[PDB]
């Protein structure tokens, strides 16, 4: 039965916001089992509150927040949760006073800045959020979540060149996960330029050697190579090696979809052959 | 094993001191937890440490990225007067509550013998293992209590685990980063990959 606890913990660990199941299991486990659980419920309240905000209810929010208040009176985290409550109901300046206060009584506190920025972004404004986030990063380096958010924001502003610099800062450290290299390759391939596609195939490869079961990296390599084999600016040797790259990748994709098939094979073979 | 000893000794002087030392080695841990402090020193130092660590990791594994980028940051760090390192300028507690208690004991449980150690010892160490006795004829395996206490101490170390300047630093980073090779180190992955086959059998 305790499985519910471990599933909640899982969703806490690998952030998996869906805020439909969470609130259910929370309200189930917010009951008498609380006294059974023992000194562990508080995190479950901090986790159910946010998912509830995500579901629209807002009724369970104050119950969880007031439990938190009564246990931890002079806290800071519950203050952040009150700021969240405010900004959901669209009291922005109040929340700003709050965050500036608990930064004023604690300058080396990050969460207040990272909520001020969420507010600045929820208004619609981006360009000032970016410089605020950089002025933050100008002090609190080693904030990987921030680097990834910055990369996403530069992407949605259609500046694909500095997002790559952030991804460099972010896959230099923790260089054992495919996702970062893959997203770097997608950035570059989108950026255009042969000098970049030569990197796109490289990193779509390295991101495959690691996992060796990813699929997006595979199609990425296939498309990068196939497009190299038509750009009339490279010596023959380039094109002849990219042809074999693409053909081998095609064979491997054939293997994969064959495993899958136990009608798709038709369409994928068409895609293969048409070039 | 030639002697016959009172069982009351076992009861009332042996187990007490295989217990006391255990609970004191626990309390020492819990109190050390309750004691340690933690500063809020400054934004400046934390930022400086963070960037120094960025430099460290750069020097360590800055060889999975384009060369020009590595060189660009290396320039932003080393470039004369632009480089970041060229613009910014600025036991006892353990031992003592163990040595103070042996004394209490040897002042309290003094005038008798406690137990035997099954390996023969050297004779010169006798006068300090017994400490009450006036035989000067026994072998030294027959000990007093204090020795049992200290033995317990050393024997229960390993069984709690089972149940539980700025500018110079900057300049040294700069100097150790001057001499550095990119060594891109990704320039055969393509072949290596498409060398035997693709490997996945968990679908």
């Amino acid at each position: 039965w305790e499985e519910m606890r471990d599933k909640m913990r899982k969703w806490r660990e690998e952030n998996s916001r869906n805020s439909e199941q969470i609130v259910e299991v929370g309200e189930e486990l917010i009951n008498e089992y609380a006294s059974k659980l023992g000194d562990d419920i508080w995190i479950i309240y901090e986790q159910v509150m946010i998912a509830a905000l995500d579901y629209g209810r807002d009724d369970l929010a104050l119950f969880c927040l007031q439990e938190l208040r009564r246990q931890f009176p002079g806290s800071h985290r519950v203050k952040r949760l009150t700021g969240m409550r405010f900004e959901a109901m669209e009291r922005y300046d109040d929340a700003i006073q709050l965050y500036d206060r608990i930064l004023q009584e604690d300058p080396t506190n990050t969460a207040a800045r990272k909520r001020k920025i969420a507010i600045r972004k929820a208004q619609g404004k981006n360009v000032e959020a970016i410089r605020e986030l950089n002025e933050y990063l100008e002090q609190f380096v080693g904030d990987q979540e921030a680097w990834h958010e910055l990369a996403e924001l530069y992407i949605n502003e259609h500046d694909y060149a500095k997002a790559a610099f952030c991804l460099e800062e972010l896959m230099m450290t923790n260089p054992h996960n495919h996702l970062y290299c893959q997203q770097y390759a997608e950035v570059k391939y989108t950026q255009g330029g042969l000098e970049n596609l030569e990197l796109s195939r490289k990193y779509f490869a390295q991101a495959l050697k690691l996992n060796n079961r990813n699929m997006r990296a595979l199609f990425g390599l296939y498309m990068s190579a196939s497009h190299i084999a038509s750009n009339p600016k490279a010596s023959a040797k380039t094109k002849k090696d990219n042809m074999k790259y693409a053909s081998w990748a095609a064979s491997q994709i054939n293997r994969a979809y064959q495993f899958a098939g136990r009608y798709s094979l038709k369409a994928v073979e068409d895609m293969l052959e048409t070039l | 094993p030639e002697l016959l000893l009172d069982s009351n000794i076992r009861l009332w002087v042996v187990l007490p001191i295989v217990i006391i030392t255990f609970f004191v080695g626990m309390i020492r841990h819990y109190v050390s937890i309750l004691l340690q402090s933690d500063k809020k020193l400054t934004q400046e130092q934390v930022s400086d440490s963070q960037v120094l660590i960025r430099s460290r990791v750069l020097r360590e594994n800055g060889k999975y990225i384009p060369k020009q980028s590595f060189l660009t940051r290396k320039y932003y760090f080393n470039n004369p007067e632009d480089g970041f390192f060229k613009k910014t300028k600025r036991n006892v507690t353990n031992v003592l509550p163990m040595i103070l208690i042996g004394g209490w004991i040897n002042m309290t449980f003094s005038g008798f013998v406690t137990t035997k150690v099954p390996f023969p010892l050297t004779l010169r160490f006798k006068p300090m293992l017994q400490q009450g006795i006036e035989l000067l004829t026994l072998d030294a395996s027959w000990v007093s209590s204090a020795s049992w206490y200290f033995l317990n101490v050393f024997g229960l170390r390993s069984i709690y685990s089972l149940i539980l300047d700025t500018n110079k630093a900057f300049k040294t980073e700069w100097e150790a980063l001057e001499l550095t090779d990119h060594q891109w180190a990704l320039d055969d992955v393509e072949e290596e990959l498409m060398a035997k086959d693709l490997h996945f059998e968990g679908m």
């Binding site: 990063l137 259609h158 610099f165 950026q191 255009g192 038509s230 | 660009t72 940051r73």
Partner: peptide
């Protein structure tokens, strides 16, 4: 002939100078 070809088009430690 690739039918669907698309073309879409200060951070501390970022310069563009092709430094050697």
């Amino acid at each position: 002939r690739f039918k669907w070809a698309i073309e879409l088009s200060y951070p501390v430690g970022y310069l563009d100078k092709q430094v050697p």
